[PDB]
Amino acid sequence: TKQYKNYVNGEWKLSENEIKIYEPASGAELGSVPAMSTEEVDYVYASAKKAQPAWRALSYIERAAYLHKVADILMRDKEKIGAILSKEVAKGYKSAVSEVVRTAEIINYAAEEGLRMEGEVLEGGSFEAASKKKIAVVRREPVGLVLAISPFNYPVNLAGSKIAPALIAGNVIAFKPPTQGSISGLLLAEAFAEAGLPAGVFNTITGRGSEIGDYIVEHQAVNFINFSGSTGIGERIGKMAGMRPIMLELGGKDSAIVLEDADLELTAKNIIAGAFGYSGQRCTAVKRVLVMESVADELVEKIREKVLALTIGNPEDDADITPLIDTKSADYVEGLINDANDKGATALTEIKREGNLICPILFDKVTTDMRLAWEEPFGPVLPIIRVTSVEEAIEISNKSEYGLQASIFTNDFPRAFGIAEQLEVGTVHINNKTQRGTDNFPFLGAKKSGAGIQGVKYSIEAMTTVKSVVFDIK
Amino acid sequence: TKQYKNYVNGEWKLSENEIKIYEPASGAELGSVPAMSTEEVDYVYASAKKAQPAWRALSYIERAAYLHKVADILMRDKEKIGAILSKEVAKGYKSAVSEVVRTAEIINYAAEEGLRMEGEVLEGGSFEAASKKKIAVVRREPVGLVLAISPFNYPVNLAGSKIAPALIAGNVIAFKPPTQGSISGLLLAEAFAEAGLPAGVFNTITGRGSEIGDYIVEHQAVNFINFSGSTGIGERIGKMAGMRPIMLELGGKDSAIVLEDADLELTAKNIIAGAFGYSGQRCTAVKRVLVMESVADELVEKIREKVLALTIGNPEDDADITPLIDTKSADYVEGLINDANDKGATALTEIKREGNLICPILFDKVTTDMRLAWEEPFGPVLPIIRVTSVEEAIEISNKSEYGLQASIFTNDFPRAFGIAEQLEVGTVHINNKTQRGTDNFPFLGAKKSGAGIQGVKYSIEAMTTVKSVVFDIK
Amino acid sequence: KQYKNYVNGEWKLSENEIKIYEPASGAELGSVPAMSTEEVDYVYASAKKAQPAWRALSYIERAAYLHKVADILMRDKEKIGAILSKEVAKGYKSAVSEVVRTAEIINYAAEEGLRMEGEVLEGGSFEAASKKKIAVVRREPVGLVLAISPFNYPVNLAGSKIAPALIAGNVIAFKPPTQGSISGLLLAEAFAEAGLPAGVFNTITGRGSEIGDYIVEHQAVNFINFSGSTGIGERIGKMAGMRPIMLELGGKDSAIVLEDADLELTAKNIIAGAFGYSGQRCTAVKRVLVMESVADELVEKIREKVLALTIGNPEDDADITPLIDTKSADYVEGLINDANDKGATALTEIKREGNLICPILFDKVTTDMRLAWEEPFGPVLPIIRVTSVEEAIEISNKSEYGLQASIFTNDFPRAFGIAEQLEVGTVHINNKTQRGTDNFPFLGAKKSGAGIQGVKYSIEAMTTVKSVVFDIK
Amino acid sequence: KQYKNYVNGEWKLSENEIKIYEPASGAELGSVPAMSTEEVDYVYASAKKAQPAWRALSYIERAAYLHKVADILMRDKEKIGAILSKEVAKGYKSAVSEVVRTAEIINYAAEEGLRMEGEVLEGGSFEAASKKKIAVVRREPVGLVLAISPFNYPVNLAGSKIAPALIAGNVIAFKPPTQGSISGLLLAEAFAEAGLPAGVFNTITGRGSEIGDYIVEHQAVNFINFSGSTGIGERIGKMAGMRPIMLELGGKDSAIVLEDADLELTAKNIIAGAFGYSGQRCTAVKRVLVMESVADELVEKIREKVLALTIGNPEDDADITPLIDTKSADYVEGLINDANDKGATALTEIKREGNLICPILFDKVTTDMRLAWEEPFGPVLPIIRVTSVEEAIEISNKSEYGLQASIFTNDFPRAFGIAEQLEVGTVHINNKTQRGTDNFPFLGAKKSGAGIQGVKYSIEAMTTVKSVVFDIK
Numbered sequence A, B: 001t002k003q004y005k006n007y008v009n010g011e012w013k014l015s016e017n018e019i020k021i022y023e024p025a026s027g028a029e030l031g032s033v034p035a036m037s038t039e040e041v042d043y044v045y046a047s048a049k050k051a052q053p054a055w056r057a058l059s060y061i062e063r064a065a066y067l068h069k070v071a072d073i074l075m076r077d078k079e080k081i082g083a084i085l086s087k088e089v090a091k092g093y094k095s096a097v098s099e100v101v102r103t104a105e106i107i108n109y110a111a112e113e114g115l116r117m118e119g120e121v122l123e124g125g126s127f128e129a130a131s132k133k134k135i136a137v138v139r140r141e142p143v144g145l146v147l148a149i150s151p152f153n154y155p156v157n158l159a160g161s162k163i164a165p166a167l168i169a170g171n172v173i174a175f176k177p178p179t180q181g182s183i184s185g186l187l188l189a190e191a192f193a194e195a196g197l198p199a200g201v202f203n204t205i206t207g208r209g210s211e212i213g214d215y216i217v218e219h220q221a222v223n224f225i226n227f228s229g230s231t232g233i234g235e236r237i238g239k240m241a242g243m244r245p246i247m248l249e250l251g252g253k254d255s256a257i258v259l260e261d262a263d264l265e266l267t268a269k270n271i272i273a274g275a276f277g278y279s280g281q282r283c284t285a286v287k288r289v290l291v292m293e294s295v296a297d298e299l300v301e302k303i304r305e306k307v308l309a310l311t312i313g314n315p316e317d318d319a320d321i322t323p324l325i326d327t328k329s330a331d332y333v334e335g336l337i338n339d340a341n342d343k344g345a346t347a348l349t350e351i352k353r354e355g356n357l358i359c360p361i362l363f364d365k366v367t368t369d370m371r372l373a374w375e376e377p378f379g380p381v382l383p384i385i386r387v388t389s390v391e392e393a394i395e396i397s398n399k400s401e402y403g404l405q406a407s408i409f410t411n412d413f414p415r416a417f418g419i420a421e422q423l424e425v426g427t428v429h430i431n432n433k434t435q436r437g438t439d440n441f442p443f444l445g446a447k448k449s450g451a452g453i454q455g456v457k458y459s460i461e462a463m464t465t466v467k468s469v470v471f472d473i474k
Numbered sequence C, D: 001k002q003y004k005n006y007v008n009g010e011w012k013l014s015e016n017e018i019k020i021y022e023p024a025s026g027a028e029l030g031s032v033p034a035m036s037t038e039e040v041d042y043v044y045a046s047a048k049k050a051q052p053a054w055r056a057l058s059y060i061e062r063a064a065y066l067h068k069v070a071d072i073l074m075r076d077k078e079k080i081g082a083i084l085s086k087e088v089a090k091g092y093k094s095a096v097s098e099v100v101r102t103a104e105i106i107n108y109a110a111e112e113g114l115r116m117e118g119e120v121l122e123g124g125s126f127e128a129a130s131k132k133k134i135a136v137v138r139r140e141p142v143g144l145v146l147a148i149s150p151f152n153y154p155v156n157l158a159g160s161k162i163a164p165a166l167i168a169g170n171v172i173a174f175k176p177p178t179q180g181s182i183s184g185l186l187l188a189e190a191f192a193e194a195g196l197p198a199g200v201f202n203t204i205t206g207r208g209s210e211i212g213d214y215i216v217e218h219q220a221v222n223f224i225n226f227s228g229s230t231g232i233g234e235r236i237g238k239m240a241g242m243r244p245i246m247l248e249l250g251g252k253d254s255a256i257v258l259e260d261a262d263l264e265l266t267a268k269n270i271i272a273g274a275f276g277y278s279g280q281r282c283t284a285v286k287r288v289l290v291m292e293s294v295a296d297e298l299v300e301k302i303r304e305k306v307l308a309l310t311i312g313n314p315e316d317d318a319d320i321t322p323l324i325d326t327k328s329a330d331y332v333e334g335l336i337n338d339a340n341d342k343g344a345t346a347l348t349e350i351k352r353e354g355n356l357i358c359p360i361l362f363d364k365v366t367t368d369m370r371l372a373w374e375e376p377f378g379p380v381l382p383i384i385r386v387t388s389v390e391e392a393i394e395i396s397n398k399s400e401y402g403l404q405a406s407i408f409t410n411d412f413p414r415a416f417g418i419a420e421q422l423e424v425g426t427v428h429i430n431n432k433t434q435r436g437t438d439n440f441p442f443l444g445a446k447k448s449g450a451g452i453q454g455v456k457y458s459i460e461a462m463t464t465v466k467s468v469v470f471d472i473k
Ligand SMILES: NC(=O)c1ccc[n+]([C@@H]2O[C@H](COP(=O)([O-])OP(=O)(O)OC[C@H]3O[C@@H](n4cnc5c(N)ncnc54)[C@H](OP(=O)(O)O)[C@@H]3O)[C@@H](O)[C@H]2O)c1
Pocket: A149, A150, A151, A152, A153, A158, A176, A177, A178, A179, A180, A207, A208, A209, A210, A212, A213, A214, A217, A228, A229, A230, A231, A233, A234, A236, A237, A249, A250, A251, A252, A282, A283, A284, A376, A404, A445, A449, A450
């Protein structure tokens, strides 16, 4: 199979050791990626630090052009990359091409968003008369070397969301894709190589996150860690980061609160699309329904039928439900199913597993006593929790240690907004499924779902500090 | 003994154990402060979390009103507080009173700055045509419970700079002052008590940071940690915070770069004032002069003469140089002085120590081979390092692990601005000593000097998060 | 009792004066000066002379002066209110409220203004070759600002211009309305006691029909901040030449009522918005556009609430007091007669006692009636029934006025979509229209005005920018 | 030969036409329609009809159209520049530069405008009782914008208005200068090929002397964005009424030279800023205010550098080219004559051949000479010797113009101090004046303009705000 290579200091490098990658759906070998040594990781960081000063010396418009070029290249090769991305993560071919497309759209937007960066002028006379002739010219500077780490489910899209914002501001990148998804990650790297950015400005790292994961995060050459993945790992990175700045996008368990005055048809469709997209292997997705009892039977009946219409199959055919990322992930999901079942939950759709392809399951009658009501499944299993008041839904919703997003289905806006203030999440969508949707929009999670505010504009702000030059006027 | 109490959930409290505080300049007992146990800490936090919701439900102008009363009380009692502060940390009485005035000003400014909290409306149609009718209404929200920790040299000033910005935003506070300075800390607490903020909104914690320090920081009730202290403790706080947000203000070794075309008389005064203020026990302060050989002889001669003009005595006499904070510090400072003398640097003043009162001393011909070239003394000792190029001055300056602020004395502004870009620090002052000065201005430190951007406005932004509510217009 | 203008630190009288009478009783209140052109010239010359030293002060210093003035107004709110109440026949308690509102706006403008910020723009954003070139952009004052207030809020709509103007470093020439000049000068007193530098703040009294055009045409004035009728507003638009202006003009705010509305909540908001100060409010519900199906219910509710309104003298705090003058009363009565005479259904008796007009509600008002379009400025409310939301938007936009609008309904997304279509500045959902919350932007479309007000915007409007560009080496 | 106007997606000629000739050669370039008032009415009627649907489009959709227009311009920069150069006798290479610059501004405005954001304000910021009330403020287009460019930059100063306008959701009615209308129609071609909806972008041609007032006074126009003489500008101010406007008028930029100035750097900048396009530029050094102790040395450097300036035809990219028309050169000659009679010294040959005047350097110019204040728009540079910085500022501010200023010194703190005092929009330290980098603000003080330009400010200027207020429950 093809031995992929990391892009280091303008050169493609193999490592003495490698990691073989297999297709989650077919099981066929896709290729191998390098299993870097600490020494090699040192070389990557040393290269990026050396290239930083000259990268920062360039003009904003110059750096923007480089990023636009990468986007253009990605668009040109969107089908070649999608073909392999689809295979590497058992993701539908079309959505795979979609991820590549969104990645280009984000890179472009971040490029133009970051070149308009401005500074401020503050008046000393605002705080004290004696200082009225003193002013502060405050401009933005990069934080230095940014370590970007993406997730298996969006190894490219959630790579660009970090890389472009970091680069437009004059930062340099060390990109570490998920092992399962590193080929797609290195394919993204090829685009940066061809755009011709100076050597060391963009570099990749590959190896098992469990073998060099800590080493790359603890390394003192790194000035900022931008991460997406499980909460468990996020916590660890939080500590290893020390006092250095970070950005974390972690686990989710988005609740969809359904009131009595909700358009039940619109709620059912939105929940279906949000809950079962990518077989529930999505971070920001409806993972629990908190519906007022008087409307529960009707809502559940609607959701049941819609689940039956979902297509089940191979990513090749763009099936709604494809095989899960791996065996363990599927075993884990079966565990949640067993627990809900043993404790009384009602499965309204067939419980079936063929390999790692689990059929879409609708669990009604789920209670706060079942694991499924709290733990993030990352499988096609949607639990329905019947409540008796808005107050109860909020309690249950906030009880979760997760707070990425929430949906409120109601026709009483003012109340919706009031409820929104109470929910401990980053974003609340009214009468719509949750979604990172519209990358210029802020994206964040409360509690253990993250740290920092994402969304293009915010990402750029997050990976820059300020340099204040003060002087008195004569 | 005069036993001071902590302010907890609207009440004053003592603990089974206490800590006696003495005057660093005389040994006289000032009183004692409680040495809280973990249970008492747990209660402070439980009381704060309970009061946070009702505090956040208030209007901005209401919270602003409460803060303005505190400020008025502080001004009214500036002579009272100043008197005790002066004795607790052996700081000049007049500067002590000035600290209180500075605290009130900051509280007033944070009240008005924060009540004008604004949000933003983003257009979905900015990213994709299909979401043109989708908008995002983003409003600021508090993070929750903020743990504020001040240093011994500005126990009140560096308390207000955290408390007020935090409170106006809807966060609740737990204020931990430094032990040597805890009486002044509880005096400040009095103002919040008399102002009548709801019980639990503001609370204090006293005890040895080496006995409960880690406990209060590690407690999972704390949502944010705002700290000013040594780099050592800061690094420690960065780790215990996990993935929780923090603000750190640490060690400094601000350099004063002096170019050949500088106004030597103006440069000497700024240097004398900046380096010897509060006997060098300041964080933002000229602690090393990097001066071009060409003008070094003349510059040094001016500084030498101004040093001998500095008054030395007790805090009640408003002396320039007063006894250091404690024996360990005087010992340490004496150690740095001796290492420079023994290594051959040129002492331009007599070496003299009486008790913990170290006479101001100037060293010329200091080399990078000397400890005094890098270590933060926190004593009246100023090293002069001669250089032969701006290039070298910049290298020596960036070589330090500290990067709080810096001073550039020159008449070539364009170049001064150019040099500023290269200096790894937060703020660069042209023709003026370094200073946090004008609290509306950003205040941050690079490398190991800190994390986060202070300055009233920035403090508020840092201690708030965002809540996005998205819906479609019909 | 003769009142004097405040000019260049001195209180000055003119030979010619103008007596002011209580609109409710007719009792003489006092007299205000009737300035000559030369006198006006001195006010302006004093201001221009003082502007440099005024601008040279720190922002915080200027804010302290304003905070002073405000504190003084709060202290004398009853004293000033008692006279304002009588000068424009406004409820005593609400007159005091105007004073407080004025103090609040002054304080708020003080703190909003000292936080004035600048920008640092990067040349490298536009072209590589200019990457070392930066622009430090700071805000500066325009110069001399001429503020003119209306009779209905002679003080409130004075401070809303003066404070924003001053904090930014401009100097003020304040022209209160003739009927309301005593309250204006009373305000002037607060500024005098505050001790602002001589010439920084000045007042001008005199009939707008005798000197109005002169004060505006004077080439010393750099900015005109006006509140009044559209007719005058439009004139100022022309006399201003190319100079910057801010105009707050006429309004005929509509209250669109949909079928899913809370009729009880809608009625109360409409009563409050329509009859406040006897309808002598610019931003106020002046026409209801309601879906037929719920028209009958809504109208019955509004009818009863109208009858519960108090009618009387300003000292008794009546809801409905005598209109500002006889000419206005005649106009309002003409609008009432035209509606009745054309077949509109009057749900309240028609009665005028002197210049006191009783609140009246007209139902079945057609676009054929004058009341459907002209700003009455009296206690008369027309109800126009429509059969669709589309028709309500058409009827609303058809007006030449577009200050604010109200939409009563439970369908928010639809309300937002309607707001976009409405040609107005602000749309309130399930609430009467209001300038309310002075930090909020306040503006009108079409013939309702020019420029965006509200503390923040007022300040931005009365300052320009100074860009200093240089290259870093 | 016969060019057509682009109206509502169609190219149309008018009953009458206007012939355009090459300023430098006199040859006929072609003709442009001479619209009748009725044809103007159709342009406005068409644009107002297509505005709603143009506004209904997403920001990114509108930005895409602008990008395409920009791309077409880059593709035809030579083709267009060749004709532009001849229409206004501008160097061929700099003519192509205008087109490029125009494309750059269009792309920048597209991306700047699509990122447009709104704001949410808290009622609880002003009063505790309105803490549940919030205002969702979003930006809306003003509607129909009339864009009018000058002869010297018919394409550049057209696109600087059109792009910021369109991205915001407004519709455009573009009126170029007669001498430059062909270029303008060439620009229109790019918009037609980009395929923007019909009526969104339209052009108007006709002598600004017959329809000039008609197009401005028309009530369909919501905003007028103009660049031209102070005279026509003052007039548009009045004809605008109370409608919003943007004016970029005349300038008499001063270059203040201090004793510590880098005289060689100073001189080079002055030569470049003063004689660019034969002085037919608005933002340009038009008067040197130099300290006496260094004048002789600076004047000598300037005198020599002037002699190195090329003089000839536009096709040869000559530094100095014929002036726009006969009257202009007559006017310049009038200035040179008054300067001579009054005593000034001409250090370079005074010569006129046709409408091509050789670069003239006048030294010993006093404030009594017309040349010291009047905008020449000819290759004539007056040097005014002062004996104190205080005087330089006085003389500089004495002018009725205040577009930009240059300060050549090395004492920055002081330069900044001088800058605050200079009554201009922008101050360049040690660099000739310039609209320099389009994201930077561009504005003029006093009679040099109205409104703040610069891409970002342009967009904000041609947009209003819509506030929807509701209470959270
Ligand atoms: N909120 C959001 O925006 C967001 C976005 C994406 C994902 N998520 C969450 O991410 C999870 C699914 O992603 P995943 O399975 O890929 O998560 P994961 O197992 O946490 O890994 C995420 C990334 O972390 C790397 N990693 C592992 N151990 C590390 C260590 N010690 N130090 C540094 N990096 C280390 C991984 O490398 P290897 O692949 O080599 O192990 C991978 O690139 C879900 O819980 C989902 O909700 C949330």
